[PDB]
Structure formats: structure tokens, C-alpha cells
Design an enzyme around this catalytic site. Sequence first.
Site, PDB file in Angstrom:
ATOM      1  N   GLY A  10       0.771  -1.224   0.000  1.00 21.60           N
ATOM      2  CA  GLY A  10       0.000   0.000   0.000  1.00 21.60           C
ATOM      3  C   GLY A  10       0.808   1.283   0.000  1.00 21.60           C
ATOM      4  N   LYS A  12       3.956   3.857  -1.549  1.00 22.32           N
ATOM      5  CA  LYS A  12       4.512   4.254  -2.836  1.00 22.32           C
ATOM      6  C   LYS A  12       6.027   4.386  -2.733  1.00 22.32           C
ATOM      7  CE  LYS A  12       0.359   6.629  -4.403  1.00 22.32           C
ATOM      8  NZ  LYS A  12      -0.142   7.908  -4.967  1.00 22.32           N
ATOM      9  N   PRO A  14       9.628   5.566  -4.633  1.00 23.27           N
ATOM     10  CA  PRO A  14      10.209   6.337  -5.739  1.00 23.27           C
ATOM     11  C   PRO A  14      10.976   5.434  -6.698  1.00 23.27           C
ATOM     12  CG  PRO A  14      10.616   7.418  -3.627  1.00 23.27           C
ATOM     13  CD  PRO A  14      10.147   6.011  -3.333  1.00 23.27           C
ATOM     14  N   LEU A  16      13.291   6.215  -8.820  1.00 25.21           N
ATOM     15  CA  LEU A  16      14.706   6.520  -8.905  1.00 25.21           C
ATOM     16  C   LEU A  16      15.237   6.657  -7.482  1.00 25.21           C
ATOM     17  CD1 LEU A  16      17.131   7.036 -10.685  1.00 25.21           C
ATOM     18  CD2 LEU A  16      16.168   9.199 -11.292  1.00 25.21           C
ATOM     19  N   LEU A  18      19.178   6.518  -5.051  1.00 29.43           N
ATOM     20  CA  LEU A  18      20.632   6.641  -5.031  1.00 29.43           C
ATOM     21  C   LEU A  18      21.256   5.376  -4.449  1.00 29.43           C
ATOM     22  CD1 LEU A  18      23.109   8.613  -5.442  1.00 29.43           C
ATOM     23  CD2 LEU A  18      22.950   9.021  -2.987  1.00 29.43           C
ATOM     24  N   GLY A  19      22.145   4.743  -5.219  1.00 31.81           N
ATOM     25  CA  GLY A  19      22.928   3.630  -4.704  1.00 31.81           C
ATOM     26  C   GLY A  19      24.103   4.099  -3.865  1.00 31.81           C
ATOM     27  N   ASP A  44      19.319   3.640  -1.395  1.00 29.81           N
ATOM     28  CA  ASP A  44      19.551   2.205  -1.252  1.00 29.81           C
ATOM     29  C   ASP A  44      20.823   1.979  -0.444  1.00 29.81           C
ATOM     30  OD1 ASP A  44      18.832  -0.648  -2.128  1.00 29.81           O
ATOM     31  OD2 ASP A  44      20.995  -0.481  -2.539  1.00 29.81           O
ATOM     32  N   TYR A  49      27.820  -2.636   3.239  1.00 28.76           N
ATOM     33  CA  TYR A  49      28.542  -1.565   2.555  1.00 28.76           C
ATOM     34  C   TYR A  49      29.432  -0.766   3.501  1.00 28.76           C
ATOM     35  CZ  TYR A  49      25.008  -2.500  -1.102  1.00 28.76           C
ATOM     36  OH  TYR A  49      24.161  -3.098  -2.024  1.00 28.76           O
ATOM     37  N   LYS A  78      19.307  -3.740   3.886  1.00 29.17           N
ATOM     38  CA  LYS A  78      19.361  -5.161   3.576  1.00 29.17           C
ATOM     39  C   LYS A  78      20.044  -5.911   4.714  1.00 29.17           C
ATOM     40  CE  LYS A  78      20.285  -3.705  -1.204  1.00 29.17           C
ATOM     41  NZ  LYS A  78      21.288  -2.629  -0.971  1.00 29.17           N
ATOM     42  N   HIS A 111      19.364  -9.707   1.694  1.00 29.54           N
ATOM     43  CA  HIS A 111      20.327  -9.218   0.698  1.00 29.54           C
ATOM     44  C   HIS A 111      20.632 -10.286  -0.350  1.00 29.54           C
ATOM     45  CE1 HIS A 111      23.853  -6.149   0.363  1.00 29.54           C
ATOM     46  NE2 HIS A 111      23.569  -6.640  -0.835  1.00 29.54           N
TER      47      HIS A 111
HETATM   48  N1  LIG Z   1      21.295  -6.088  -3.899  1.00 30.64           N
HETATM   49  C1  LIG Z   1      22.541  -6.310  -4.307  1.00 30.64           C
HETATM   50  O1  LIG Z   1      23.105  -7.415  -4.184  1.00 30.64           O
HETATM   51  C2  LIG Z   1      23.272  -5.176  -4.967  1.00 30.64           C
HETATM   52  C3  LIG Z   1      24.386  -5.433  -5.759  1.00 30.64           C
HETATM   53  C4  LIG Z   1      24.975  -4.405  -6.473  1.00 30.64           C
HETATM   54  C5  LIG Z   1      24.463  -3.128  -6.370  1.00 30.64           C
HETATM   55  N2  LIG Z   1      23.419  -2.886  -5.543  1.00 30.64           N
HETATM   56  C6  LIG Z   1      22.904  -1.478  -5.356  1.00 30.64           C
HETATM   57  O2  LIG Z   1      22.794  -0.868  -6.622  1.00 30.64           O
HETATM   58  C7  LIG Z   1      23.595   0.340  -6.657  1.00 30.64           C
HETATM   59  C8  LIG Z   1      24.047   0.644  -8.061  1.00 30.64           C
HETATM   60  O3  LIG Z   1      24.913  -0.402  -8.565  1.00 30.64           O
HETATM   61  P1  LIG Z   1      26.510  -0.253  -8.604  1.00 30.64           P
HETATM   62  O4  LIG Z   1      26.989   0.610  -7.496  1.00 30.64           O
HETATM   63  O5  LIG Z   1      27.018  -1.640  -8.698  1.00 30.64           O
HETATM   64  O6  LIG Z   1      26.839   0.457  -9.992  1.00 30.64           O
HETATM   65  P2  LIG Z   1      26.210   1.508 -11.031  1.00 30.64           P
HETATM   66  O7  LIG Z   1      25.205   2.353 -10.329  1.00 30.64           O
HETATM   67  O8  LIG Z   1      25.823   0.727 -12.240  1.00 30.64           O
HETATM   68  O9  LIG Z   1      27.529   2.322 -11.422  1.00 30.64           O
HETATM   69  C9  LIG Z   1      28.201   3.160 -10.454  1.00 30.64           C
HETATM   70  C10 LIG Z   1      29.431   3.690 -11.140  1.00 30.64           C
HETATM   71  O10 LIG Z   1      29.029   4.543 -12.240  1.00 30.64           O
HETATM   72  C11 LIG Z   1      29.630   5.817 -12.104  1.00 30.64           C
HETATM   73  N3  LIG Z   1      28.684   6.811 -12.598  1.00 30.64           N
HETATM   74  C12 LIG Z   1      27.534   7.224 -11.977  1.00 30.64           C
HETATM   75  N4  LIG Z   1      26.848   8.108 -12.660  1.00 30.64           N
HETATM   76  C13 LIG Z   1      27.598   8.290 -13.809  1.00 30.64           C
HETATM   77  C14 LIG Z   1      27.424   9.129 -14.923  1.00 30.64           C
HETATM   78  N5  LIG Z   1      26.388   9.961 -15.060  1.00 30.64           N
HETATM   79  N6  LIG Z   1      28.369   9.092 -15.887  1.00 30.64           N
HETATM   80  C15 LIG Z   1      29.410   8.264 -15.742  1.00 30.64           C
HETATM   81  N7  LIG Z   1      29.680   7.428 -14.736  1.00 30.64           N
HETATM   82  C16 LIG Z   1      28.731   7.494 -13.791  1.00 30.64           C
HETATM   83  C17 LIG Z   1      29.966   5.956 -10.620  1.00 30.64           C
HETATM   84  O11 LIG Z   1      31.059   6.885 -10.454  1.00 30.64           O
HETATM   85  P3  LIG Z   1      31.148   7.960  -9.261  1.00 30.64           P
HETATM   86  O12 LIG Z   1      30.471   7.388  -8.075  1.00 30.64           O
HETATM   87  O13 LIG Z   1      32.649   8.148  -9.112  1.00 30.64           O
HETATM   88  O14 LIG Z   1      30.469   9.214  -9.791  1.00 30.64           O
HETATM   89  C18 LIG Z   1      30.373   4.527 -10.278  1.00 30.64           C
HETATM   90  O15 LIG Z   1      31.700   4.254 -10.712  1.00 30.64           O
HETATM   91  C19 LIG Z   1      24.681   0.037  -5.630  1.00 30.64           C
HETATM   92  O16 LIG Z   1      25.424   1.183  -5.241  1.00 30.64           O
HETATM   93  C20 LIG Z   1      23.849  -0.598  -4.522  1.00 30.64           C
HETATM   94  O17 LIG Z   1      23.150   0.445  -3.849  1.00 30.64           O
HETATM   95  C21 LIG Z   1      22.818  -3.874  -4.857  1.00 30.64           C
HETATM   96  O1  LIG Z   2      26.113  -7.616  -2.243  1.00 28.85           O
HETATM   97  C1  LIG Z   2      26.227  -6.491  -2.668  1.00 28.85           C
HETATM   98  O2  LIG Z   2      25.262  -5.606  -2.658  1.00 28.85           O
HETATM   99  C2  LIG Z   2      27.511  -5.978  -3.274  1.00 28.85           C
HETATM  100  N1  LIG Z   2      28.655  -6.815  -2.923  1.00 28.85           N
HETATM  101  C3  LIG Z   2      29.537  -6.584  -1.890  1.00 28.85           C
HETATM  102  C4  LIG Z   2      30.472  -7.556  -1.845  1.00 28.85           C
HETATM  103  C5  LIG Z   2      30.183  -8.470  -2.908  1.00 28.85           C
HETATM  104  C6  LIG Z   2      30.776  -9.643  -3.382  1.00 28.85           C
HETATM  105  C7  LIG Z   2      30.237 -10.319  -4.462  1.00 28.85           C
HETATM  106  C8  LIG Z   2      29.103  -9.813  -5.058  1.00 28.85           C
HETATM  107  F1  LIG Z   2      28.557 -10.515  -6.097  1.00 28.85           F
HETATM  108  C9  LIG Z   2      28.475  -8.653  -4.647  1.00 28.85           C
HETATM  109  C10 LIG Z   2      29.037  -7.985  -3.563  1.00 28.85           C
END
Ligand SMILES: NC(=O)c1ccc[n+]([C@@H]2O[C@H](COP(=O)([O-])OP(=O)(O)OC[C@H]3O[C@@H](n4cnc5c(N)ncnc54)[C@H](OP(=O)(O)O)[C@@H]3O)[C@@H](O)[C@H]2O)c1
Ligand SMILES: O=C(O)Cn1ccc2ccc(F)cc21
Length: 316
Positions: A10, A12, A14, A16, A18-19, A44, A49, A78, A111
Site C-alpha cells: 500500500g 509508494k 520512488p 529513482l 541513489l545507490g 539504497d 557496505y 538489507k 540481501h
Molecule cells: N542487492 C545487491 O546485491 C546489490 C548489488 C549491487 C548493487 N546494488 C545497489 O545498486 C547500486 C548501483 O549499482 P553499482 O553501485 O554496482 O553500480 P552503477 O550504479 O551501475 O555504477 C556506479 C558507477 O558509475 C559511475 N557513474 C555514476 N553516474 C555516472 C554518470 N552519469 N556518468 C558516468 N559514470 C557514472 C559511478 O562513479 P562515481 O560514483 O565516481 O560518480 C560509479 O563508478 C549500488 O550502489 C547498490 O546500492 C545492490
Molecule cells: O552484495 C552487494 O550488494 C555488493 N557486494 C559486496 C560484496 C560483494 C561480493 C560479491 C558480489 F557478487 C556482490 C558484492
Amino acid sequence: MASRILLNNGAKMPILGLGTWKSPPGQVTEAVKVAIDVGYRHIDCAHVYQNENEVGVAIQEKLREQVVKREELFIVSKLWCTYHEKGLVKGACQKTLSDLKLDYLDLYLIHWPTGFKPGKEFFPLDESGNVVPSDTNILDTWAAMEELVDEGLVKAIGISNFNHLQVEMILNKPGLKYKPAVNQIECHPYLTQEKLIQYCQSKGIVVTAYSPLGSPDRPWAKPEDPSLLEDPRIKAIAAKHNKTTAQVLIRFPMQRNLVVIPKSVTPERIAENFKVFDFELSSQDMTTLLSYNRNWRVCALLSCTSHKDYPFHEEF
Ligand SMILES: NC(=O)c1ccc[n+]([C@@H]2O[C@H](COP(=O)([O-])OP(=O)(O)OC[C@H]3O[C@@H](n4cnc5c(N)ncnc54)[C@H](OP(=O)(O)O)[C@@H]3O)[C@@H](O)[C@H]2O)c1
Ligand SMILES: O=C(O)Cn1ccc2ccc(F)cc21
Ligand SMILES: O=C(O)Cn1ccc2ccc(F)cc21
């Protein structure tokens, strides 16, 4: 495009956010403050982290200064793999709440489906390089997550990196009380996830796309790996629309009814990445981007490929 998607609890959410994975602790407070200033309302986070305290400083400053009200923010964290035991879940959630300086989370995710042996180490390994699992069944971890809703610590619960059979297992859990609100999975033009997305959406589960830019700062990047941000085909679509490649990569999941969580600590990119509500990719653009799939993962959890609950052996 509407800025929020209705969840099956129930509330909402967003579309978009921020990771914060890899955001250095000395830069993430500024990053989150800038993000809130320029319109982000969803952050996020995760205990693993190691930067939730610093994220929390930013959130709290913006709340205290009345830049945003708590009810307008959507904060996600997570439960890490070493806290799957039912007796550890509440404390793990409460540590995240303390660090984020919040009295509830909007969404708390399992996670990964894999539970690991509890202890100080986030990845307890054996001599084969494989993780040391825990015997807690994920259905039991889910029941512990449900208790957090009933205690008021989280508004919604969900899952991350669950394959379709694992989602199905929860949906079929005996005595299921709350369905997962979200499954957060890797998704981008090289890992398009049509099957898993359709399955989740058909059950009323919202999908969040992680690593939408291909995670160029991932710690294990190799030179021969593909690169979304440098793919000339994607650059061409961006040029046609007078947008950046990153903006195309963020808009793409939005038009699939996904939530998307690009990470940046760079103020100018944080602002740029939010400027994605003012253009539309065509159906042809969408199908073309989908055609780039190669089942290529940033996050393959390679130390855990023998864990009984490893998610990525199954087709989807
Ligand atoms: N649930 C999970 O297991 C899991 C796993 C992976 C990720 N995540 C979440 O998803 C988020 C996003 O994924 P991610 O961190 O793997 O990578 P991403 O968001 O695909 O890429 C981040 C990278 O892109 C760069 N970047 C950002 N905006 C840009 C732009 N406009 N132009 C050029 N480069 C740009 C950043 O540089 P700068 O920061 O230097 O600007 C950083 O190096 C994570 O931070 C986390 O919150 C969750
Ligand atoms: O789980 C995460 O969100 C990001 N992460 C942090 C350590 C790590 C290692 C392997 C992987 F596949 C994802 C990983
Ligand atoms: O495990 C992986 O999925 C990918 N990976 C490859 C080397 C490496 C090192 C640390 C880590 F946390 C994850 C890593």
C-alpha cells in the site's frame, strides 16, 4: 512519468533512488545530501557496505533542516548473509536503524538467499575458497523478516538476488503472512532479465534494477569486460535523444516499470542522473536495448557457487 510505484503493502516507492555500494565513507554524506537537495527521495543502503552511519548523517541533517520530511523519504536497507538466523535478524535491523538514525525503514531486504555462518566476518570462507553456510532455512529467515513489520521497525520487506524458484518458494511458504514487496536484482542491457521480471511483476512484486550503469567501479573489473557506458550503440541512442549514456541507461529500466538505483558520489553526476523524467525512449529503442543481452553479471557471488541456495545456477 510518475515518480513513484505502488507496492503491494500500500506504500509508494520512488522509481529513482541513489545507490551507495562503494561510496567512500568520507564522500557518501555529501553525496546523499546533494541527492536529497536535487530531488532524490529513495536511498539504497546495506550494512555490508560499511557506510550506513555516514548515510545516516546526511539523512538526519536534511530532516533536521526541514529540507524533506521523513514520510517523503524511502530508505532501503538489507539483512546481510551472516544474520539469517532468526535470533539475529532483529539486532541486525536495529543496528542499521541506529546507524541510519531512523526509527523505521521503508523497505528491508534479504540481501542474498544464501545464509552464512554468523560471526564477525561477512564472508566466512573455508580452504577451498567456498563460503561456510548456515543451516537456517530461508523460509525461517522470511518469518523473522515478517516479525519486523509487526514490530513497526520496517514498513515493507522484500528479497534480493532471488531466482524465480526462490521467489516461488516464499510465495508458497506455509503460513506466509506478508508477500515480498520487492525483488532487487541486477539488470541492464547486458543482463535484461525478461523472464524473472515478468514472473515477479505477474505476482505483484516490484523489481528494482541494480548496477544499471554496469558498475564501472566494481572491484573485480577486468579490461576485457564489456562496458555499457562506452558501448557505441548505446551512445548512439543517447545522442539521438540529446542525453548522456548514463541517462539512457537509467531511463531504460524506468520504462519497464522497474525501480532503478544508480550510484554516484560525484555531485554533477548525482544531479545529471536524476534528469530522466523529461524524455522517452521509443518502443524500438527499448527493444534494441533489450537485444544487447548477454547474461553478463557484475555480481555473481563467486565464493558461494556451492551454497545450496546459490541463486544463479537456474535459468532464471
Ligand atoms: N542487492 C545487491 O546485491 C546489490 C548489488 C549491487 C548493487 N546494488 C545497489 O545498486 C547500486 C548501483 O549499482 P553499482 O553501485 O554496482 O553500480 P552503477 O550504479 O551501475 O555504477 C556506479 C558507477 O558509475 C559511475 N557513474 C555514476 N553516474 C555516472 C554518470 N552519469 N556518468 C558516468 N559514470 C557514472 C559511478 O562513479 P562515481 O560514483 O565516481 O560518480 C560509479 O563508478 C549500488 O550502489 C547498490 O546500492 C545492490
Ligand atoms: O552484495 C552487494 O550488494 C555488493 N557486494 C559486496 C560484496 C560483494 C561480493 C560479491 C558480489 F557478487 C556482490 C558484492
Ligand atoms: O566474488 C565475486 O563475485 C567477485 N569477486 C572476484 C574477486 C573478488 C574479490 C572480493 C570480492 F568481494 C568479490 C570478488
